[PDB]
Structure formats: C-alpha cells, structure tokens
Amino acid sequence: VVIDPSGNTYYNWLFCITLPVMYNWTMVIARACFDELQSDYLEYWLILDYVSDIVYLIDMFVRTRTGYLEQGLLVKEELKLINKYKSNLQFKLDVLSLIPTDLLYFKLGWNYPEIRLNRLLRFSRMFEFFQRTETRTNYPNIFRISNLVMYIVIIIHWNACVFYSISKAIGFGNDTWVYPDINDPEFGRLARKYVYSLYWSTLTLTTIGETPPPVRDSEYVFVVVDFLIGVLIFATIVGNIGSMISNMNAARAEFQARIDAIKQYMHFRNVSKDMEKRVIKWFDYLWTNKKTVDEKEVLKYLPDKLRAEIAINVHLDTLKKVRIFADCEAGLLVELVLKLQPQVYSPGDYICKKGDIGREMYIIKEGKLAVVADDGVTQFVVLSDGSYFGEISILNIKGSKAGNRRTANIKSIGYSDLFCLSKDDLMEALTEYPDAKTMLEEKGKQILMK
Amino acid sequence: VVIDPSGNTYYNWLFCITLPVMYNWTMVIARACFDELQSDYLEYWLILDYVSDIVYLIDMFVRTRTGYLEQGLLVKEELKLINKYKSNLQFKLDVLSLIPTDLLYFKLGWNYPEIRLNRLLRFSRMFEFFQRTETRTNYPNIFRISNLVMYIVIIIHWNACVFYSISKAIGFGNDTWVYPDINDPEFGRLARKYVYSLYWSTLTLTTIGETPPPVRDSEYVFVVVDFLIGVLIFATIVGNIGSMISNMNAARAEFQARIDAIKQYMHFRNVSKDMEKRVIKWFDYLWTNKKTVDEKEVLKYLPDKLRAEIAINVHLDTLKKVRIFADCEAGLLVELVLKLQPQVYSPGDYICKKGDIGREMYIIKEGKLAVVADDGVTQFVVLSDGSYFGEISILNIKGSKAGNRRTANIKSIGYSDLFCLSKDDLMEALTEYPDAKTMLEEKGKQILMKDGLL
Amino acid sequence: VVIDPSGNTYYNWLFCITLPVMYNWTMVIARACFDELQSDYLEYWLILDYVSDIVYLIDMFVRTRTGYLEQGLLVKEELKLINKYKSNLQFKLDVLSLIPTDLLYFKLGWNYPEIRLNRLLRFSRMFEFFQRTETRTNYPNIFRISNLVMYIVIIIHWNACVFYSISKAIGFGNDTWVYPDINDPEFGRLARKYVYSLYWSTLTLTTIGETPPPVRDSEYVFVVVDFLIGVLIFATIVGNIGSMISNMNAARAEFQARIDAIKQYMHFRNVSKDMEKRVIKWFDYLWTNKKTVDEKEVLKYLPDKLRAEIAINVHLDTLKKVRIFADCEAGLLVELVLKLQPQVYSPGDYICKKGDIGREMYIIKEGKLAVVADDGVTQFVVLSDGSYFGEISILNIKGSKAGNRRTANIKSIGYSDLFCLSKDDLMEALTEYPDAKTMLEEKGKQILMKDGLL
Amino acid sequence: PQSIDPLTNLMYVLWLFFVVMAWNWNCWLIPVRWAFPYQTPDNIHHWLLMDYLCDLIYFLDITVFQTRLQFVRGGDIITDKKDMRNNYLKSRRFKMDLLSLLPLVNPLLRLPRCLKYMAFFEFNSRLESILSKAYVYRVIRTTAYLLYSLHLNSCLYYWASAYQGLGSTHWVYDGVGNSYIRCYYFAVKTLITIGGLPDPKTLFEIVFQLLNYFTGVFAFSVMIGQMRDVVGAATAGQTYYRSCMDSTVKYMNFYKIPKSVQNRVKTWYEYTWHSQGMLDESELMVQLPDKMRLDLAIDVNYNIVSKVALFQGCDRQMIFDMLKRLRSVVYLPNDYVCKKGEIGREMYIIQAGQVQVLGGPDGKSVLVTLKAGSVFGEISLLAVGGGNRRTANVVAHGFTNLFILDKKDLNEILVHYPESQKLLRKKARRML
Ligand SMILES: Nc1ncnc2c1ncn2[C@@H]1O[C@@H]2COP(=O)(O)O[C@H]2[C@H]1O
Ligand SMILES: Nc1ncnc2c1ncn2[C@@H]1O[C@@H]2COP(=O)(O)O[C@H]2[C@H]1O
Ligand SMILES: Nc1ncnc2c1ncn2[C@@H]1O[C@@H]2COP(=O)(O)O[C@H]2[C@H]1O
Ligand SMILES: Nc1ncnc2c1ncn2[C@@H]1O[C@@H]2COP(=O)(O)O[C@H]2[C@H]1O
C-alpha cells in the first residue's frame, strides 16, 4: 500500500504530524525557560513527549510509504520509496529529530527539557502542511492571515521565553527591566510569569515599547536587537496584510481600471450619452453577473485537453440539437464546439440586420432574441435559450434565392449570451471531413428546397 | 592581466573592498563622536586605517585593470582602461577618498578622526557589491533582508553617534535629554555610552519614543527632525519588506487569480461537478509539481537564438530517433524542434481515439502511454518516454488505406507530458526544404508498402 | 503675447506663484495662532503680504494670458482666454483669494491675521507647480519624497498652530496638557512656543505619543481626533513610500520572475548544465548592461511617424551603405528600417552556418562577427559595425547557385547587437515599390554574375 | 414608482443611505448601551424611540423597497409585481432581513439588527459607480471601519474597567470625564499601538492589554495596507505612463538620438497622456465585447465614413469592418501627414485638429485647411502596388488626431465582401 501525496489521506496525516511539531516548537522552549511549567505538569509533559515521539516514528514510516511521481505514475515499489526517502536531507533531519537525548534526563535532571530541542527539526512537516493548506483551502486569505498570526505568536512566545531566561540569568528583581522577584505571590504565579513575559515580548516585537527601560549593558543590547527584530516583524505583518488587501481586490481593481478607461475613452471621443449609459450598464451587468473577464483569456491557461473537454461539457449538447449537425460524426462536432466564439449583447442590440451578409451561425445560450420587422415594434417569434439561426447561411448551397443574405433583423431583447460559428471556421473544420461536408451541403439543399 | 567584471574574481574583490568601506562607514563617525573609542584603541585604529587605505589603493589599481565591454569584447588595452577610469567620476571620488588627511592629525589633534570622513566616498564599491550579490546569490529575499537590516543598523549607529555628539556639545548631564554625566561610574563607561546612544537612536528612529523629553530648543528641533527621519526610515522598511512579500507570492497570486477565473467560468457555464473536480485536481498538480507557467510564454523571454538552443538541447535527440526524420538536414530538424508544442495529459486521458482525425505527431517527453483497445481496459503496448506515434498522419500520402485517421486508441496511463508536431507546422517547415519533403514522402510511401498499407 | 502652459515660462511663473502660496499656507496661520510672531515682525509681514498680493494679481493676469489647446491650437485671442478663465472655478477662487480683508485690520486690530486665510484658495497654483515639477524632474522618486515630506511638515506646522491656539483658549499652564505658562522665562519665548508646539504636533501626528496626557474632555476629544488625523497621515506616508519602492523594484521584480520561470522550466526539462550556465550568463549580461528592455515593447505605443524617425536616426546611415539599397527610394528605406528586428548574440554564437537556409539579412549595429571555416578555429574576415551579410539571400535571385542557402559560417566573437531584416519583411516593404523590387532583383543578379554564382 | 431599478435609481440609493444609517445606529450604539450606563430610566424612551425608528426603517425596506426591485434573470428585465416579490424571498437578502428583525430591555437582544449588513455592501457598490474617483470613499469607509473598531474597543475597555471596578487600579478607567471619550482615548492609544497608558497590573488587565495591542498591530496594519493599495491604484496609470515614457527616453539615450527627435517623442507622450489619458486606445478596445467595440466605432466614425463618395453603395457590414480597423494617430504640429510624391496607401479621417494642404510656388501656401470630420486620401486605397502617389504636401496644423485606415487593412477586409469588392474596384477603373 502507498499514500498519494496529492490525496486527502496525506493531507490528513500532515495535520496529524503538525500537532507534535507545534507542541515541540512552542512548549519545549516554554518548559526549558519557565521551570515551574516544566516541574508542575511533568507527567503530562512526559505523556505528550512520548506521544509526539510515537507520531514522529509513524511519520518516518509514512515517508517510506509516500509515493513520488516519476514518469507521471505514482511509485509503489517499496525499495524505491525507501531509497528516495533515505537519499534526501529529510531522512537525516528525521533521524536527528528522534535522537534519544531524553537519556540526559537521568544525568542533567528533570528540569532540562531543552534536550528535546532536536524535535524542532521536524519543522518541514509543519511547513509542508501549511503549504498544502494554502492550496486546498476555500479561503486563501483567511488561512493566510491565520498562518501569519500563528507565526507571529510563535515568535512572540519564543521571545517571551528568551526574555524570561535573560531575567533568570541576570536575576529576578535585581533591576527594573528584568522580570520581578518570583518570591512575590503576585509575580511568582506561573500564569502571571508567562503572561507578563508574553506581554513584554509582544510590546517589544511590535514597535510599541511601553516596557521598563534597560539597566545593564546586556539588557540594552538585547532590547536594541529585539526592537530591530520587532521592526522586521511589524513590517512583515504590514506587508503581508497589504499584499492580502491588494490580492483580494485585484480583480475589482482591474475591472475598475477598465471601466475608468472606457469612461475616459467615451469622454474624449465625444461619444453620445445614450451609448455611454449603455456601456456603463453593460459593464455593471457583466460585473454583477460575474462575466467580467473574457472567456478566451480565462480558458487559454487551461491545456488543450481540458479546454476541449470543458467546451464539450458546455456546447456539444446544444450543437447536437442543430438540425444540420444532428447527423454529423461525433468526432467532427468536437472541432465545431472548439471553434464557437462567445458573443454578448445588450437590450436593443441587433445581432444581424435584414440584407446583411450572413457569415456566422449564432447559438443562443442565456438570452432571448426577437425577429423584428425592420421597425423594432413587432416580432415574428421570440427565440429562447438553446435556439439558433443562420445554420443554412454558413453552408454553401447553389441555387439559394436568398443565400448569403440575412432574411430578417435579429434583435436582442436583453443581455443575450450567444455563441457564433463562422463560415470560415466551419469550412476549415470540414476540410478534414469531405463526406461530412458533402452531406451537410445535401441536407442544407434539402432544407432550402422543402 | 585584465579582470573580467562579470567574473567571480571581480565579485571577490568587491567583497574585499566592501569590508574596509563598511569599516570606515561604521567606525569613523563612532571614533569621531565617541572620543574614548578613538583614544583607547588608537593603535588598532591606526593599523586598521592603514590596511583600509592599502585596500583602497589596490581597489584603484583594480579599477585601472578592470576591463569594460566595447563592441561586445572585453577591453584589454591598458592605456584605454586608464583613460576610461580617469574619464569617470569614480576616479575623482577615489582620489578624494585617498586624499591624505592623516597629516592633519598633527595640526587638529590625535582625537579628531573626522578627517577620515573622505574614505566614505568609496560607497560605490559597497553598493556595487550589494547589487552583484543580489543578482548573484540564490537567496535574493534573505540577502535583501540582510541588506536592509545592515542599512538600518548603520543608520541607527550614525544617529546614535549624532545624538552622543549633540549631548557632548550641549553638555553631559546638563539636562535630562542629553546623555548623562560621563563622570558617573555607570554612564562613564565607553560601552555604556555607545549602547545607550544606540538604544536612544533605536527608539527614536523606529518611532517608539520613550526617551527623556527635550529641554532646550535645539534638542526639540533635533528630536522633531529625527523622528521625522525615523518615520521615513520605518516607511522605507515597510515598503521594502512589503514589496518583497508581494514579489514572493506574485506567482501564487497570479495562479490563484487564474484558478478563480476558471472556477467563475465553470460556475457560470453550469459545468458538471466531475469536470470541475478534474480541473481543480489538474491545477493542484500544476502547483505541486512546479509546472504552473506555460512554456511558450516562458520561452518568449529568451532570444530567438537562445530559445532555439534550449529547444535543440531538449528535443533534438528524441526527434532524431523518429524513423521518418532519421536522416534529415540539421536546419530542418532544428525548425521542426522549434515547431513542437507541449501537451500535458492527466491519467486516463485519451490522446487519440480510434476514428479521430490524426493531424499531429506526438512524441512522449515523459510519461507512459497505452495503446488501449475499444473496451478501454485492455492495452496492446505501453509507450514510454522518447517514443512517438502519428509520424505517418502528418505526411500527406496519396492512396493511403488509412487517410488522416487514428488506427488505435491512445490513453495516458499517468500524468503524461509530451510534444506534438502538427501537420501544418511540418508543411510550413518543409516549405523551405523541398528535397527533404520529397524524401519524407518517399519514406512514408515505402513504410506503408512495407507494412501492407497503401 | 500668450504664455504656453507646456513651456518653461509657465513653469517659472508656477514657481514664482508657489512661494506666496506656501508663505500664506504656513506663516498666516503661524501669525494667527502665535500672537508674538505677528506683533513682533509686523512690518515684515505687511511687506511680505503686500508682495504676495501683488504676485497674486500678476498670477491672475497670467491666467488671463495663458493659452489652451482648442483643436490642437494654442488660443491666442485675448477675449477667448479671458472668457475661458472667467468661466472656470479658478477665477472665482482667485477673486475670493484676493477679496480685500486687510480693511478688517482697522476693525479687529493688528492681532488678527487670520482674516487673510482666504489667500489659501490659491492652493491650485502650488499643486499644479508640484505636479509639473514631478514630470519635469529627472529624479521623480526624490521629488516625490520631498513633496510628501513638505506636505507632512505643513500639516504638522498647522497642527502645532492649532494646538497652541487650543492651549491659549483653555489657558496657558491651566493643566498638564496645554502649553505651559507664557510668563515663564523659558516657555515665554516665541521660538520655544513654536518649537514645542511643533514637537507636540510631530509626536501626535506620527502616532508616537510621548506627550502629556489630556486632562479636560475637550482636550481628550482633540487628542483623539488629532491622533486619528495622524493615523491617516502615517498610513498615507507609508503607503506612498511603499508604492514608490514597489514601482522602483517593478522592473527588477519582473526580470527576476522571468529568470525564475526560465530556471523552473529548465528544472522541468532537464536542460544540460552548460546550457543553463550560458542562459544565466546571458541574463546577467542583460541586467548588467541595461539591455533587458525589448525594443518592440518600448516603441509599440509610438506612432508610425515618430517611430520611423527614431528608427531612421538609428539605422538609415548603415542601411544606405548596403550595396543593394544604395539607389533605393527614401520611402522604401523608411519601411525597411522600420522592419528591422534587433537580435543580440552571445560570444561564440553562430548567427548562421554553412548550408543553413538564408531567411534574413543581418546588419551589425554593435559587436564583431567573424567569418569562420567548417572547424571554426580559423577566421576569414572580421565584420564590424555597419557591415552586413545575407543581402542576396533575401532577394532570392532566380538561377542562383547558392539557392537561398548560407555559404559561410558567421560567428559572434563577442556580444553582437544585430538587426535582422527577414525576406518576408523585405517583400512586405517592397509591395508598394515594384520598380524598386525590380531594381533590387537586377542588382542581385549583377552581384551574382560578377562573383560567378548564378 | 411601481418598480425601481436598483443599479440606476437615485431614490433607491438614498433609501440605501437611510437603511445604512439605521443599521449604523444598531452597530454603533448597542455596545454603548451594553457597556456604558447611558441607557438610564430617565432617557430610556429616547433610546426605544430611535430603536423603533430604525426597526420601522427596516420594515419599510423589506416590505416596500426590496419587493419592488427589478432583477435580471436570463438577461431579461423583470418588471411585474409577481416575480419581483417572489424572487427577493428566494434570495439571501430576505433570509438575512428576517433574522435582522427577530425579537430574540437588554441592548444585546437587538444584536440581530446588526446582521442587516448586506444593505451596506449594496449601498457601497452604488457609491463605486455613482461617483467618480471612488478611492476617496474607500479611504472614508476604511477610516469608518477603524473608527468602529476603536468604538468597540472603547466599549470593551469600559466594560473591563467596570467589571473590575472603576478606579480600582491605575489601568482601569477611573470614572471622571465623559466616560466615552476617555475610554475611546485608551482605544486610540491602544489600537494604534501608541502607548503612554498606565501599565496593567493585574492578570486580567495584562491579558486584556496584550490582546488589544496585538489586535491593534493588525488593525493598524490593515489601515496602512488599505492606504498602500489605494495609493498604488490611484497612481497606477501615472506610474505606467511614466515607466513607458522613461523606457523610450532610456532607449533613445542608448542609441544617441538627438534631442530634436527626443523632444518630439516627449511632446507626443505628454500630449497623448493629457488628452486621452492613454497611450494606446486599441489596448482597451480588445478587452471590450465585440458588439461594444463595434457600437463605439459606429458612434464615433460611422457618421463620417458613410458620407464619403467612395464607399457609397457598399455593404454596411464592410463599412463596420472599416471602423474597427481604423487606428487613432496623433500628429505633432507642422508634421507632414502626406509628402508630395511618397506612396499613398492610407485614408485619413480628421477626428480633431486642422490639416493644411500645401501648394502654390515652392509650397508653404495653404490652399485649403481641412477641419475635423473631413476625409482625405481615400483615392489611395484603390491603387495596387504603389500606384498612388500624393499630389500635394499635406501638413498638420497643430496637434491633429487622425483616424487612419491603410490599404493593407482595407484589402484584408475586402476579401470577405465580394460584392463591394467588385463595386469598389469598378469605381477605381471608372475614374482612370
Ligand atoms: N418569419 C420567420 N420565422 C422564423 N424565423 C425567422 C423568420 N424570419 C427570419 N427568421 C430567422 O432569422 C434569421 C435571420 O437571417 P438568417 O438568414 O440567418 O436566417 C433567419 C431565420 O433563422
Ligand atoms: N498495435 C500497435 N502497436 C504499436 N503501436 C500502435 C499499435 N496500434 C496503433 N499504434 C500507434 O498508434 C497510432 C494511433 O494512430 P496513428 O494512425 O497515428 O498511428 C498509430 C500507431 O503509431
Ligand atoms: N570571404 C568573405 N568575406 C566577406 N563576407 C563573406 C565572406 N564569405 C561569406 N561572407 C558573407 O557571409 C554570408 C553568409 O552566407 P550568405 O549566403 O548569407 O552570404 C554570405 C556573405 O554575405
Ligand atoms: N486643393 C485641394 N482641396 C482639397 N483637397 C485637396 C487639395 N489638394 C489635395 N487635396 C487632398 O490631399 C490629398 C493628398 O494626396 P492624395 O493623392 O491622397 O489626394 C489628395 C486630396 O485628397
């Protein structure tokens, strides 16, 4: 059995290994620095350390059963997976992350959990889990701000532990900058110790200050360096939030730039005000109903296989409905779908006029069209969704008395979405289908003569 | 000998000249403002300044021996390099940097290292080395953080020296804003002097405040100007880091915008759920395996000659194994390589179906392709990388039994990445090779006769 | 006489009107809030205000004599310019900025110079001068920074005046928040008054605090509102500087993104190490020599006439030296120059090999090309700037023994900037010149007969 | 008004303003009445009266105004009363309006009324279209978001002060002053991370101050990040124009182009940017719908192209192809539009400016000045292979924008219209 890295099981295990890494990256340093935290809950820390070590062994077992993708196929051979795991640097980090440094507990004592700082080397699993999460998640921005908050909180927690350790090394309460005397009942509480250390670290790492000034030279040096780190952290927070803000309304900014450009164009070109209102209403409708970006530009980032398959899933069923293409080969209709060009219209727009040359065949997708009588007040018939016209004009039938000319004016009732198949595209698709072209000409001749 | 400016020796010398430039820029003002730093370690500063001036002289020699690029060729004529160096502002700046002002130690005094402030005019070497590292290192973002941090550190150090010198001019301990009396056991130490000045500068330039409020009008004015400068510095830090952050996820922002546009299209068109899931899986595969950017627009950035070289190095060996192209001219093969189009298929995708029209030749760059039967589950032969099919369909041979049709179903077993050569591209390449076109027609005809076709 | 708004005289008058506008925007509120400043230098303020009013009248006169572009013509009719000025809101603002309020000095006294606050309505001249200095300067980022800093300084000065006025209204020394008692020998000085007010305003408008807390509810309201204005100011500063940093790094960001994309493509396609190093060296050459721009993308916006003039000034002197184009018509030369495409070659690159298809003519702008034998070790002749080859291959003379094929190997000794002219582009230029096409074919025939290659 | 259009109506956006200020009353004042003791028996009836006014505004909204909103289904404009009422009930807006009025004198019982925020987002969308230069409202809306975050912070601080006890410690609010602007001041110092406040002593105060400062760090980053995006978006066009103009100046400096040519390029860039706000109008037109692009080209050029004698009787669709192939070219003052004796291959339509035709002895005599809306050079489109040569010098009399259609693009759109191709070719041979 092998685990697909792109599957849901690998992501579910990535969460299950992220918890011991987060426990080690946050609480090992807290127990190393805050001695009361390590001493009071020692049995719970032993249980959690043993559980995290077990999960680390299982994680090393998972990487021996995680397939890598060569020649487009997932590798299921056990020896290839073992050698791929052992060849990378990750195996060395995983082995170093599980070196039995806990044997020093019987040498140094039960108050030295910094021997488990090698367990921090499994950070790659945490980073891989977060990089997979920022792909899978429905909300990239919410997870991005949550991840930034988590990283800032972890750094603040580490700096709080560092500040408490520096206060311990200097001595609690010897000066006003260090943490005060822990023999005081208020200051001696472990919750008070950690919360005030986190408060100091949050203050210093976010360019707030609001802390007692340093007294000794080492305290001044540490405060200067940690304020510089805090400037970096605050600038990172502001830059991440600003990049998030820019990415969140990037499409809105692009659409607003486009509509401002078209407003400037119709103001400069002395375009009539009714046309200006029509263009502004059209753009507002396109943004409101989520059709702002061109279909050609959207789908060109897809491969040719998926673009054709998506187009087949959209247009093929309607193309079969067209009378001329009803008997066509299933292979031929694939190219005709791929040559369909989207066309959008406004209320009152004329798709075609009577006496115009018909070079396209329009397929109505999400609109209603009217066959007006050169006045715009009466309609022969209203063409609903799935209808079509110009299917005979694209074909070339000799003897057509009204051939190559539109027989009536087609008027869009309102905001119609069409798909045209031009005569040139049909001919270049039929160049590879001679028999189909002849039978289309025969069927069009039959339609014209009936 | 002439040093190539784009080589590694030039970068190594850029580091070797940046070290004394950074030493001067960080320590001349420190010794000028903190007099005890200058007086206590004066011998060490003497050897360090002498070594820095020696390295400055060797830098001027390297500038005389640094070749520029004329007519695309490195200039190696010595007198031309001398004239090019002396015709630039950098020669004047280097001469001003190495003006001997250590002779003014006898006049002004040994406690006046302000005379060595002209050595700060070699800043162009430091910036040049930083730009070369930025365009050279494999960690542009980490190096940009390091460079911004070092700039902020040197600016804070300069402002610390300025604050200490202002306190010295006003009077040590005269009021509460200045550095306190330097006769104190604690604040009289040079280490304490520098680190408290650095702390005050760090608070002020990072717009944190929490420094003793000014007393005198000059102190108030300097504090106003220096918090304004600190606001500008903080805004510069935030702008640099935010620009870097936007650059580091510009590719992700663009890819997510593309995926959002595709999803909006699929919801607009009421595309079926399985098709949407397939598209999402394909884009996840693209992001995971670093195949997001399309190859055509990536190769547009290359020049035509260099893109042709890349295409040759990728495709010529696998195109020379095609039986029709076994013995062809080099130019025709290069053009046909340039006409290749990448096609990537998901597992289970059908490259060709039986009855589909064949107008392309597909060459498997990587992946496994199956010649599957009509049932869709039994395969005839697995085609590995480097293999090809459709070499006959691109050739237009009269009288062929199978005309522009696919004889068997071709199915992608896995994530197959392969290149297609269309019939139209082959004809357009063969327009300038008519003899090669005739040879290709003859080879296709003889292949069809050998196989029993035609 | 009519002043052209795009000329240097209009910019000079914009500078000449900006100084009274800046003086009114700063020192009028400075004298209104600080009564000592108004009373002590009253004669100087009267002289400066009279001078500023005179300059305002001359500014209105210039506005009546400043032309505007109607149908591309600068209007020089006096009545049309006067009517265009009067129909604009700027005339109303200029009238309201020069309503005589100095007559109210006899009613309110010399202590009230805030009656001249209507002179602030000439802010449009200051903004126009700065927005025209932004375009005219060669350092847009430096001037952008200077403009932002001086706007922030003006707002800080205004808030300092407002804080001093609020302290005056509440009472000097009434509580710990206001400015102290002005009967103090230290705090009663005008310089100390303004400088401490500026200190308070700088600390509050930069969200730094470090000021005595408000005591009264009105003081709390003003402090809250003015830190909110400071939040807006700080956000504007950091946003403008970050946009500046992103705009300056935009070319670096996109070039590095292109390099990263090409490297990712190389890791995809398993490109050989020497080819990868060649491309990396090419991109380092492009960034180091400031050649990353694409000429087509640079000149795509320009019209045909201006792009034609630029291309002529670059290439006509070397195109007229081509032996086939010596007698060509000037318009055909313009078309051929406009159809020249730049190509840059690395050292050792083969521009064309012997037996390769000759598709384009190459003209050397910069660099050296060597005609080499089949091995490439020996060189026949070195081609320099202005030299060319392939002039007969584009002609495609009938009966040619070469047969549209290259007869020699051209190798780039160094980095050569060539400009290719394809046969398709030559025919596209010649389709309007059939007589010149016949003359070109005749000249190619004469060349191929003198050499005996027909 | 039986049925109103939400996208266009101004009475509807005024009603949206009223609904926003009714919803702003609930959002801003419910935490005030929850935290501050401003909701006393002596003034409870004013609070209840304004709450009833806001609820009546909500009720009038959901009953009258939302039920008569015309909508778009399948592209059609639906106006009848039956469908508009039924469509709104099926939307998310009616679902949120029902839960924004449920009863649930505690001010926290009115917290459902804060859930009518879809009216605010709908009101925001109108202000991004009704008024030009919409980044000004974005700064105001972001500032209002900051003012509300400090407002909630002010209510949270007073609750924390009162819960511990007023004036109990130095960190809590003591009790003097307005009690709102005092606690709002603490929010301003805290949420902007300004500091200067009394230090928190008790564990509850330190935890509250820690989170508040942490929240402020991200809140102050949102304000900067929003302004950074506003500044970048407002100056994006100017930055692109400056980068494009500087690229050509850098290009012209590399090839040692003289300043006579360079100043002409600088003049064109300055004139084109200050006239049309663009550098290429066709880059915008390719992003438009094909019907939008064609209708704009008809609204600009069809009243002129349909008046020239050369294309009379031609196909109307072929003329429509001519308008789409027309490109706007700006000629500098005294620039030669046509040289006497060069190849004539273009048709010029004067959209703006004056064009002078030279002649007489030694040229430089204005035979005629062609104003905007006139077409010259149409005969050149009918020649084949350089058959047309300009018979007179033609110069631009100061910053003329010409719509140019060349012979190559006309011939490309003349192969799709064989009927007009025969007629236009017949008119060519009928005059020579
Ligand atoms: N009286 C009618 N009834 C139904 N359809 C019509 C009528 N008149 C025109 N049409 C359709 O409108 C189209 C417009 O011109 P076509 O030649 O494309 O083909 C026409 C028919 O499809
Ligand atoms: N049995 C088979 N063994 C190997 N290759 C095959 C087999 N059947 C079909 N092919 C290849 O698959 C191709 C599909 O259609 P073509 O006509 O392009 O030419 C075909 C051959 O190249
Ligand atoms: N001995 C030579 N001296 C100068 N130019 C040459 C020599 N040999 C070849 N060339 C040029 O190099 C070109 C390469 O192939 P072409 O056929 O394009 O035409 C050739 C000539 O223009
Ligand atoms: N006297 C004139 N009056 C009006 N138009 C003219 C005059 N002289 C030249 N033109 C126009 O200017 C054009 C310039 O050269 P063309 O050959 O294109 O055709 C010319 C006419 O259209």
Side-chain angles (χ1 to χ4, degrees), chain B residues 349-364:
Chain B
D349 274 4
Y350 276 98
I351 296 93
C352 300
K353 295 282 286 294
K354 188 172 180 182
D356 274 2
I357 283 179
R359 65 179 64 88
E360 285 103 359
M361 182 179 72
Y362 302 94
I363 307 164
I364 307 163

Side-chain angles (χ1 to χ4, degrees), chain C residues 71 134 217 295 301 329 432, chain D residues 182 240 283 353 389 407:
Chain C
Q71 280 296 281
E134 183 178 1
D217 278 355
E295 172 205 86
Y301 286 139
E329 197 195 321
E432 290 304 309
Chain D
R182 308 293 191 105
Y240 184 72
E283 298 188 329
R389 296 248 164 196
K407 193 201 295 160

Side-chain angles (χ1 to χ4, degrees), chain C residues 352 371 380-381 383 388-391 393 405-410:
Chain C
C352 61
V371 189
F380 304 161
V381 65
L383 306 170
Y388 55 94
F389 65 99
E391 67 269 14
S393 68
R405 284 204 181 251
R406 307 283 192 210
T407 61
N409 313 298
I410 299 278

Side-chain angles (χ1 to χ4, degrees), chain A residues 274-282 346-347 349 415, chain D residues 295:
Chain A
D274 54 357
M275 176 75 39
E276 297 205 21
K277 298 293 183 182
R278 282 166 31 73
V279 169
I280 294 314
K281 280 188 289 188
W282 204 350
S346 287
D349 273 343
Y415 287 131
Chain D
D295 268 353

Side-chain angles (χ1 to χ4, degrees), chain C residues 84-112:
Chain C
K84 175 88 191 301
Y85 179 46
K86 282 207 211 199
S87 71
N88 174 4
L89 176 67
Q90 195 47 60
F91 170 70
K92 285 94 184 172
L93 260 65
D94 289 12
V95 161
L96 288 180
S97 75
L98 274 169
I99 289 316
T101 46
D102 303 62
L103 311 167
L104 265 174
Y105 274 127
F106 307 122
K107 186 178 187 284
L108 302 171
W110 274 128
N111 181 73
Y112 280 92

